[PDB]
Amino acid sequence: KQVAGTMKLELAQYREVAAFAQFGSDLDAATQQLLSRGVRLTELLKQGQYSPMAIEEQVAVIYAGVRGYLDKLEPSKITKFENAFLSHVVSQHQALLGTIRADGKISEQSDAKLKEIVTNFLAGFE
Amino acid sequence: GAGSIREAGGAFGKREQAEEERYFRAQSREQLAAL
Amino acid sequence: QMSFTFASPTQVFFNGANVRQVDVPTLTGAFGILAAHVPTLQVLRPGLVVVHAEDGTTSKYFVSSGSIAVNADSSVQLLAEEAVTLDMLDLGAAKANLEKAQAELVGTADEATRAEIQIRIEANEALVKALE
Amino acid sequence: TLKDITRRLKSIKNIQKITKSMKMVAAAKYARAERELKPARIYGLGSLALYEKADIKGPEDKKKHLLIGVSSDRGLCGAIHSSIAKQMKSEVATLTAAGKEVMLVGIGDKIRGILYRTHSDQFLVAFKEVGRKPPTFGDASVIALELLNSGYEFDEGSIIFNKFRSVISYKTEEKPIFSLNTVASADSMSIYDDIDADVLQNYQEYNLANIIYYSLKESTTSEQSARMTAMDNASKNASEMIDKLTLTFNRTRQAVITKELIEIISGAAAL
Amino acid sequence: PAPATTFAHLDATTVLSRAIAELGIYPAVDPLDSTSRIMDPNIVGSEHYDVARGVQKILQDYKSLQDIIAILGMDELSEEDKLTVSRARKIQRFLSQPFQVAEVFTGHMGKLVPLKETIKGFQQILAGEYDHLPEQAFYMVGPIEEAVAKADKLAEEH
Amino acid sequence: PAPATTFAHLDATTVLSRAIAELGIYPAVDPLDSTSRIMDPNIVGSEHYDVARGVQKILQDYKSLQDIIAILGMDELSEEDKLTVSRARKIQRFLSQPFQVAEVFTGHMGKLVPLKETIKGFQQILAGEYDHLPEQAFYMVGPIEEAVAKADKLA
């Protein structure tokens, strides 16, 4: 709920300003930021077939997306970033995923831990 | 429903075809020179 | 009595202002311009332009080309194609590009394409003396 | 036909969306190109104060003549490229009638592609790439060179551009361009000191790049606003057409459903 | 009702469009409406699936750019957009193929292209390895080798 | 079904239109939909046939331009297209005519134009002999001389 409220608002604003695409090089920084966040988010919603993700993994990915930790990457690598980040979190941070799965909510502890993990992965990502 | 201006076939589709293919014919006869 | 007008193609420094003296680097040799100066019209060469406000306080811009035109009604219109204040130029590239210009002249012998070097030489020679 | 109306609705909706996006882009471009007109209107107009204080009138006896029409490459502006060409060919015949040989120059692909039909040999040189990027002094300086490295001994000249006044309206204007033999011979230039026929040549060659630069700034902040207005009108017209076609589409879909009902009912009641 | 009802009874539908045949492309297969049930990266491998999905994506973005080309003009488009439209037109032409049973209609030799030649040719056109060739060199050929050969012939003769 | 069936029984059809009647053009005869089996050079003459076919071609050209004119405005036309549009609008206005039976609800005298005046006026308009008169000068007149006189009177 927490993360998808923000995601829905961002995607709604991107759908409002998406007609001005192919003209983003001649618009102000507000419309350009909207377009960028929206493109990254739509790239975050793409999913393979017969690969359904758990709830904690979905919320981790959408957190890494909507917090602004993906505006630095150009869209053609968002899929690979999402896949590799998923692999890293599942193979390293089973404890945080377990706490989110059990609580169902994101504490401030878990918010700071997720910020830490996402920033360190961005540092270490290819 | 993108590409609808070309799917309709009115005045704005015929001129799309004309514009695009004249541009690309110019580019084609120019690229045949560089080869 | 003086109506100065100093303007780059993209920037305006003075406009109708009443300064008392300007010191421009005309091609036929520099001259200072106070009120009621004799009507003239010239074309600049690389060099400073000192503007003396009424308070006796100066202002020093480094024009690069253009045309000053003192008029019969004590109006001045100084138009520089590239007028950057001295706080934006560096001494190292001026002395370096001057060397790249001077060293490239001796390797050149055609009257036209060597004339473009001397103009680059004097433009950089006028730079080192303006900074320091 | 329902499929025809659906095709046309989709087409005109695409047109309306792209036209609105283009109007907002031209509004973003005009806001800038009008901020950079205030420092380029003090420069450019401060470059012609002499020819008005010295009151150079110009000689009407010389025959050779130059005529600069300033425009851009991109259309969708309205009467921008049409007002310039309207003024050029209006006075090309006016000077040709008096024996004054006129040779033209075209800044922008649009002003050339218009007059390339009628007056094509009366054409000294033409230029490109005017309009994509905001015009800079590097562009006005180049255009001035080939106006001198051309071997045309022009004895009088005028440059025609679209003077910008407001977002709603602009006017076409021509600024005179004097050569050396008229500014050196005018007996109102006898007061100007330290003047010889060389320091006037360097001053006439520079004041050719100014009046071209001042023209490229006025005719680009007057073209972006006109493109804004033209795209606004195009998007509005597309919107009213979409409204009418949606009314017709609803009528047609209701008629199709009723016709199918009547067919089924007549087939069922004939048993 | 008859086509819409028979769609569900098939595995690999191949829809033939009229707007594509009116472009001179043959067979008139519609790339953005044909469907197979074995177009699965675990059935045709990752390379074939990725090449097919890239072809379909670039053709859809071509369709989307055609509206801007309609109202604005081909001149103001970016070199990014111009290059993607060029690749899209070249992929369109390369999807066409001369048939051994259509000689009477075209006079051209019938070409049968193996699967790997197809995958490789479309991969190379997508990568840009032939952005210097005219789009008319990919029209009615076999693999990409015949495309560069036709390009050479057109370059010498013109 | 009723008009679509009655078309095949007529030697000459004069299809009226509401879209043309809204423009005040009366009679509202649709020029690009009315036909006749004696519209034949061997019957009416090569001059008459050529004038009729040229009028129809220019009206069809204007109709094809209508879309771009309506969306992208009048400016984006070439000057050849602008000339075609101007001549076509002049022809549209000239096809209008005041009827002698309408002397009670329009006020204007009813004009009866012989065939020679019709052919001559439309040939002249097609040739460009009146590209200086305004289009509202051809509206609701008889022969072409009356259009010229109305153009002079409005100025």
Side-chain angles (χ1 to χ4, degrees):
Chain A
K1 207 177 309 176
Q2 288 162 333
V3 186
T6 300
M7 184 174 213
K8 161 192 277 289
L9 294 175
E10 295 293 328
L11 275 170
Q13 294 173 176
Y14 162 66
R15 281 196 313 275
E16 290 187 50
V17 302
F20 305 157
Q22 200 49 264
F23 302 96
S25 296
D26 291 331
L27 299 161
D28 49 355
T31 308
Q32 290 170 345
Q33 177 53 230
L34 279 182
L35 281 162
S36 297
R37 179 65 60 84
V39 170
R40 267 83 184 187
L41 285 188
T42 69
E43 281 279 337
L44 214 63
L45 290 174
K46 302 184 177 183
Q47 183 163 345
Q49 207 187 354
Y50 310 122
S51 72
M53 301 167 45
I55 177 59
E56 49 256 32
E57 291 166 65
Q58 290 185 60
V59 61
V61 165
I62 307 298
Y63 173 91
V66 308
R67 289 317 182 96
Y69 296 124
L70 276 180
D71 190 13
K72 302 296 184 290
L73 277 77
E74 66 95 19
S76 298
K77 302 219 303 178
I78 293 286
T79 314
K80 312 317 279 294
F81 166 85
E82 190 272 332
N83 279 106
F85 175 77
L86 202 77
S87 291
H88 159 65
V89 185
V90 183
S91 297
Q92 290 280 133
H93 297 286
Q94 280 284 131
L96 173 62
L97 296 187
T99 69
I100 297 190
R101 167 205 303 128
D103 293 331
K105 69 176 178 183
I106 295 180
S107 297
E108 196 275 331
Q109 275 187 338
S110 297
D111 199 340
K113 268 198 292 300
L114 262 184
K115 161 194 304 177
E116 191 175 60
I117 292 174
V118 170
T119 55
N120 299 157
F121 188 89
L122 278 174
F125 177 63
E126 188 273 332
Chain B
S4 302
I5 311 183
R6 189 71 177 279
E7 299 174 350
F12 283 95
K14 274 183 171 163
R15 75 172 262 172
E16 192 270 0
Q17 185 179 4
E19 283 194 354
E20 191 185 359
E21 186 171 358
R22 295 295 292 164
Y23 171 89
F24 272 90
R25 276 187 192 271
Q27 180 167 143
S28 176
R29 63 171 157 188
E30 190 203 20
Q31 271 202 347
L32 275 188
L35 192 68
Chain C
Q1 183 75 20
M2 197 184 179
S3 298
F4 198 38
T5 298
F6 190 13
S8 197
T10 72
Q11 189 174 3
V12 160
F13 305 92
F14 299 81
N15 179 27
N18 273 106
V19 292
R20 54 173 285 266
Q21 188 179 321
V22 192
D23 297 339
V24 310
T26 287
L27 258 191
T28 78
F31 45 70
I33 311 192
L34 282 78
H37 189 289
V38 63
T40 187
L41 65 91
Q42 297 287 333
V43 292
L44 318 185
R45 67 164 196 254
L48 290 173
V49 161
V50 182
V51 183
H52 302 288
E54 293 279 359
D55 306 287
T57 60
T58 80
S59 300
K60 305 181 57 183
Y61 316 90
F62 185 89
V63 310
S64 164
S65 297
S67 84
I68 186 162
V70 181
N71 279 126
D73 56 8
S74 163
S75 76
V76 177
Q77 288 89 21
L78 176 44
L79 317 168
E81 182 189 1
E82 179 79 47
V84 300
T85 319
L86 279 190
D87 307 327
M88 311 165 60
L89 302 159
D90 58 42
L91 191 149
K95 192 172 311 178
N97 199 337
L98 159 64
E99 269 299 342
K100 294 186 287 293
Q102 285 191 356
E104 200 275 333
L105 185 140
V106 64
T108 303
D110 181 40
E111 53 267 10
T113 185
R114 83 189 301 191
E116 298 168 32
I117 321 299
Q118 314 187 206
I119 302 176
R120 185 158 71 260
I121 293 173
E122 62 159 271
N124 293 276
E125 264 184 335
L127 265 161
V128 308
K129 304 178 303 202
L131 277 300
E132 183 63 27
Chain D
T1 300
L2 207 56
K3 285 188 64 178
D4 284 18
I5 305 183
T6 309
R7 289 167 169 260
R8 202 167 148 81
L9 272 175
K10 292 181 181 292
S11 177
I12 303 183
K13 284 179 178 179
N14 285 7
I15 289 180
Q16 191 260 335
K17 286 198 307 175
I18 302 174
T19 293
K20 151 172 283 304
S21 66
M22 204 192 313
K23 162 195 169 60
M24 292 303 291
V25 164
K29 275 188 178 183
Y30 151 77
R32 191 156 57 91
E34 196 262 329
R35 274 196 285 100
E36 311 189 324
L37 181 77
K38 298 184 290 294
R41 194 183 261 166
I42 304 308
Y43 176 96
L45 272 175
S47 180
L48 321 179
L50 182 135
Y51 297 140
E52 196 275 332
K53 290 177 169 51
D55 191 74
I56 305 304
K57 294 291 184 182
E60 297 296 328
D61 68 320
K62 301 303 292 294
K63 300 294 178 69
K64 321 200 72 179
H65 197 105
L66 188 68
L67 199 52
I68 318 179
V70 177
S71 281
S72 177
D73 295 332
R74 277 192 40 81
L76 304 171
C77 320
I80 287 283
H81 320 277
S82 293
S83 186
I84 298 301
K86 162 186 56 58
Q87 179 60 271
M88 283 183 62
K89 72 182 185 294
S90 288
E91 71 174 347
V92 168
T94 302
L95 302 172
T96 295
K100 293 196 59 185
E101 160 196 7
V102 179
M103 183 151 307
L104 311 180
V105 57
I107 308 180
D109 188 74
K110 268 288 187 175
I111 191 62
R112 182 206 67 172
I114 289 179
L115 292 183
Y116 199 86
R117 168 179 293 100
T118 72
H119 325 300
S120 159
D121 56 357
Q122 315 162 230
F123 218 86
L124 182 65
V125 75
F127 304 84
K128 286 171 64 178
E129 300 275 320
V130 182
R132 291 151 169 77
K133 325 284 293 185
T136 57
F137 207 96
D139 289 328
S141 66
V142 169
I143 301 175
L145 271 177
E146 286 86 8
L147 277 182
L148 308 177
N149 297 3
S150 84
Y152 182 44
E153 298 294 328
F154 77 98
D155 294 328
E156 195 61 89
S158 279
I159 172 168
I160 321 187
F161 66 108
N162 292 285
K163 182 92 162 192
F164 166 78
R165 294 150 56 198
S166 158
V167 190
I168 61 170
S169 175
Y170 64 90
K171 63 164 52 181
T172 188
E173 192 167 11
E174 47 172 354
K175 276 293 179 53
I177 289 184
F178 318 107
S179 166
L180 192 148
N181 298 113
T182 179
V183 68
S185 316
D187 290 331
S188 179
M189 301 282 293
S190 67
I191 50 183
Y192 281 78
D193 186 14
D194 196 77
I195 290 314
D196 42 346
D198 176 60
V199 74
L200 272 177
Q201 195 152 337
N202 302 338
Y203 185 82
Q204 289 296 137
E205 289 173 8
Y206 191 76
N207 265 24
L208 186 68
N210 288 341
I211 211 173
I212 283 179
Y213 173 80
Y214 164 67
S215 166
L216 290 181
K217 307 305 282 195
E218 289 268 331
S219 70
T220 197
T221 198
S222 158
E223 172 195 5
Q224 297 295 335
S225 62
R227 174 171 289 106
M228 200 191 84
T229 292
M231 285 309 107
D232 183 61
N233 289 339
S235 68
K236 287 199 285 188
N237 292 13
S239 72
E240 284 102 14
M241 292 176 61
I242 283 163
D243 302 347
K244 297 295 185 290
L245 278 183
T246 302
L247 287 187
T248 298
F249 173 83
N250 289 332
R251 280 181 285 167
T252 303
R253 68 159 266 275
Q254 293 180 35
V256 160
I257 303 172
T258 312
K259 173 181 184 181
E260 181 198 36
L261 280 172
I262 296 166
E263 284 172 7
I264 298 164
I265 284 304
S266 297
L271 298 175
Chain E
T5 308
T6 189
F7 275 111
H9 277 98
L10 301 176
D11 297 359
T13 65
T14 295
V15 181
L16 306 170
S17 179
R18 175 175 305 275
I20 288 185
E22 286 164 348
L23 295 172
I25 296 177
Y26 288 97
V29 183
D30 191 2
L32 308 176
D33 202 359
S34 295
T35 290
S36 174
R37 278 185 175 160
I38 68 169
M39 180 45 62
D40 207 309
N42 293 112
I43 298 178
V44 292
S46 295
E47 58 286 342
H48 184 169
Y49 175 75
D50 278 323
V51 170
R53 288 323 190 190
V55 170
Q56 289 168 0
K57 185 168 193 169
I58 194 177
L59 289 169
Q60 188 64 46
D61 305 295
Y62 177 32
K63 265 186 177 179
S64 165
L65 273 154
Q66 279 174 343
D67 296 356
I68 290 171
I69 303 174
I71 187 164
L72 265 169
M74 193 66 203
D75 58 82
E76 188 64 25
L77 266 67
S78 298
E79 64 271 15
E80 210 186 10
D81 313 308
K82 281 157 175 163
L83 175 138
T84 49
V85 168
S86 65
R87 284 184 188 175
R89 291 174 67 104
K90 289 166 192 175
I91 291 179
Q92 262 198 2
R93 321 303 167 172
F94 196 50
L95 282 165
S96 58
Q97 161 169 324
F99 280 168
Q100 184 66 43
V101 306
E103 298 205 37
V104 299
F105 315 112
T106 56
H108 286 180
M109 183 86 177
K111 290 312 171 192
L112 189 147
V113 179
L115 178 47
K116 291 202 177 315
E117 309 301 316
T118 295
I119 299 170
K120 182 185 60 58
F122 283 97
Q123 206 166 18
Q124 292 170 358
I125 306 177
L126 276 171
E129 272 198 51
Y130 302 100
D131 288 332
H132 61 278
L133 299 182
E135 66 183 24
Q136 40 193 291
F138 310 92
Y139 186 78
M140 285 290 177
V141 299
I144 200 62
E145 282 71 21
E146 297 190 42
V148 70
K150 184 178 183 179
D152 289 355
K153 204 202 80 171
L154 290 167
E156 185 175 1
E157 73 173 31
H158 186 275
Chain F
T5 313
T6 197
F7 277 107
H9 286 280
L10 312 172
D11 284 322
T13 67
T14 304
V15 174
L16 302 171
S17 168
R18 186 182 303 276
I20 295 180
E22 302 294 71
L23 313 181
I25 292 172
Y26 286 119
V29 180
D30 193 318
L32 291 180
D33 218 339
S34 299
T35 74
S36 179
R37 270 157 209 162
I38 80 164
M39 179 40 66
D40 191 18
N42 313 119
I43 293 176
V44 287
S46 296
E47 170 157 60
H48 187 178
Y49 184 78
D50 292 6
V51 176
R53 286 306 184 232
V55 171
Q56 280 177 348
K57 179 175 184 172
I58 207 169
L59 287 171
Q60 183 58 41
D61 284 357
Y62 181 33
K63 176 167 290 179
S64 302
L65 286 174
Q66 290 276 22
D67 201 348
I68 281 184
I69 295 175
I71 294 182
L72 288 189
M74 185 67 177
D75 317 295
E76 313 313 311
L77 299 180
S78 300
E79 204 280 332
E80 301 86 327
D81 291 336
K82 279 164 187 163
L83 186 64
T84 284
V85 167
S86 158
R87 284 175 187 173
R89 299 192 56 158
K90 291 192 188 72
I91 288 183
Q92 277 195 336
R93 315 303 158 178
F94 196 46
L95 285 164
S96 167
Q97 175 177 353
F99 276 1
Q100 221 292 317
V101 307
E103 295 293 326
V104 291
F105 49 85
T106 191
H108 307 67
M109 179 199 145
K111 296 304 173 187
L112 201 148
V113 181
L115 186 57
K116 293 308 191 64
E117 323 289 335
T118 300
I119 310 168
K120 183 174 62 63
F122 277 101
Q123 194 169 6
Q124 290 180 4
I125 299 178
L126 272 188
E129 283 175 60
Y130 301 106
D131 290 330
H132 60 280
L133 312 186
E135 68 190 30
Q136 292 297 111
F138 302 87
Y139 180 77
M140 278 287 183
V141 308
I144 189 57
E145 293 86 4
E146 185 164 347
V148 179
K150 182 179 185 174
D152 300 335
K153 193 184 310 177
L154 71 87

